[PDB]
């Protein structure tokens, strides 16, 4: 690190966005940065655990894990059926 990351997920208008951010191993934690995403209103609070888990995955081996796609707890029943293709009820973390 530092690691240049992108969180890709739909906003409240269902528009796809790429959120760019740095993660510095030794200084930042997956839980801490996930909480930052939530406090910024970029990620739903229900998604803390899954986003933290996937952030940890991508940061520990950024050489292996170029991309991780994961379910959103917030999207499990929310009016649109989850679709990983389409990143509906899913998000994706990737190396820039």
């Amino acid at each position: 690190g530092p690691i240049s990351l992108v969180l890709r997920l739909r906003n409240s208008k269902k528009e796809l966005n790429d959120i760019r951010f740095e993660f510095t191993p030794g200084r930042d934690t997956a839980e801490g940065v996930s909480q930052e995403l939530i406090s910024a209103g970029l990620v739903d609070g229900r998604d803390l655990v899954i986003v933290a888990a996937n952030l940890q995955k991508i940061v520990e081996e950024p050489q292996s894990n170029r991309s991780v796609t994961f379910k959103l707890a917030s999207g499990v029943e929310g009016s649109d059926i989850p679709d990983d293709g389409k990143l509906i009820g899913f998000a994706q973390l990737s190396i820039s």
Binding site: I19, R20, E22, V33, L42
Partner: peptide
């Protein structure tokens, strides 16, 4: 400051 959408 962390994030750029």
């Amino acid at each position: 400051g962390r994030f750029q959408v």
